[PDB]
Each structure stands twice: as structure tokens, then as C-alpha cells.
Amino acid sequence: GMSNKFLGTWKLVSSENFDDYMKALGVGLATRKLGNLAKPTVIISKKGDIITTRTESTFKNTEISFKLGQEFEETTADNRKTKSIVTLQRGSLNQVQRWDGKETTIKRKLVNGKMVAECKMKGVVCTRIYEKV
Ligand SMILES: CCCCCC/C=C\CCCCCCCCCC(=O)O
């Protein structure tokens, strides 16, 4: 299952290409400006087979709870209503969001104790690095 090394509180220390990733999602300028300034905390916890991923920032908070491999309804930080699935692949916690015939993926993996999130849509790739708090 998911490594217990994912569990805990993570703080964003680096973000590369987030603006173009948000543009690809259809996020408007004012929102992108605040999104680029945000340095969120991400909290990953588990209760039984239910994993919760909570994101906290001054601008927006989000929270998803899911079982691996089972589709769930998600509301994203930019208020998309998606159908999402999280899978485990070679230690990587991989989230796919689908809405209106579109798709984006967020792959979270542990690298030397950091969590690295790779966000992909329409060939635009964003990398966000988090440190454990
Ligand atoms: C990080 C999301 C909350 C704070 C920023 C919200 C600003 C704009 C909403 C549009 C961004 C939606 C995509 C967020 C992807 C975050 C991936 C990650 O966990 O690093």
C-alpha cells in the first residue's frame, strides 16, 4: 500500500511552471496571480483504507478522501467538479482528474525525503517540491 512515509505535514518549498499549468486548466489571471503567491501546506493522513489529502493556504483550502483505485467526486482548488482516481505505481501516488472530456494528472512521489508533485495537462508539466514539517 501507500508508504507510511507519505503521512504527515508537507510545506511547499519550490514550484516550477505552475502558471502555465493553471493556464492549461483554464484558470483566470487574477486567480493565477494569487495561486503563484501561495505556499500551501499539504497534510496526508490515513484512517483504515481511507486516505485524506488536505491542502491549506490563505487563498484556498481543499480536501479529498479516497480509497486506492476507487473513483470519487472531487472539487478542486479552482472549483472544477471532477471524477478522480488515485492509484499507486512504483511508490508514486498518482491522481487523475477528469471533467468535461479533459484530464490532468498529479503524481506525488518521495525523493530523498521530499515529496515531489508533478502536475501534467495537455503536455504542460509543473513540478512542486515539498519538505516535511
Ligand atoms: C495549491 C492549490 C491551493 C492553493 C493555490 C490555489 C490557486 C489556484 C487554484 C488553481 C490551482 C489548482 C491546481 C492545484 C494543484 C496543486 C498540486 C499540488 O498539490 O502541489
Author numbering: 0 to 132
Pull text from the paper.
P2 is a small 15-kDa protein with a β barrel structure covered by an α-helical lid. P2 belongs to the family of FABPs, and in all crystal structures of human P2, there is a fatty acid inside the β barrel. An important feature of P2 is to bind lipid membranes and to stack them into multilayered systems. Recently, three point mutations in the pmp2 gene, coding for the myelin P2 protein, were linked to autosomal dominant CMT1.
I43N and I52T do not alter the main chain conformation, and neither side chain generates steric clashes. These changes from a non-polar to a polar residue do not induce large structural changes in the crystal structure. Also both I43N and I52T showed reduced solubility compared to P2wt. I43N has a Tm at +48 °C and I52T at +52 °C. Therefore, both of these mutants also have decreased thermal stability compared to P2wt. The lid region and the β3-β4 loop of I52T also fluctuate more heavily than those of P2wt. P2wt and the I43N and I52T mutants all bound to membranes with affinities in the 2–6 µM range, irrespective of the lipid composition. Despite similar apparent affinity, the kinetics of the wild-type and mutant proteins were different, and in fact, more of the mutant proteins eventually bound to the membrane, giving a continuous increase in response during the injection. The results demonstrate that both Ile mutants can bind and stack lipid membranes as efficiently as P2wt. With extended incubation, the Ile mutants slowly lost the turbidity, as opposed to P2wt, hinting at different stability of the proteolipid complex.
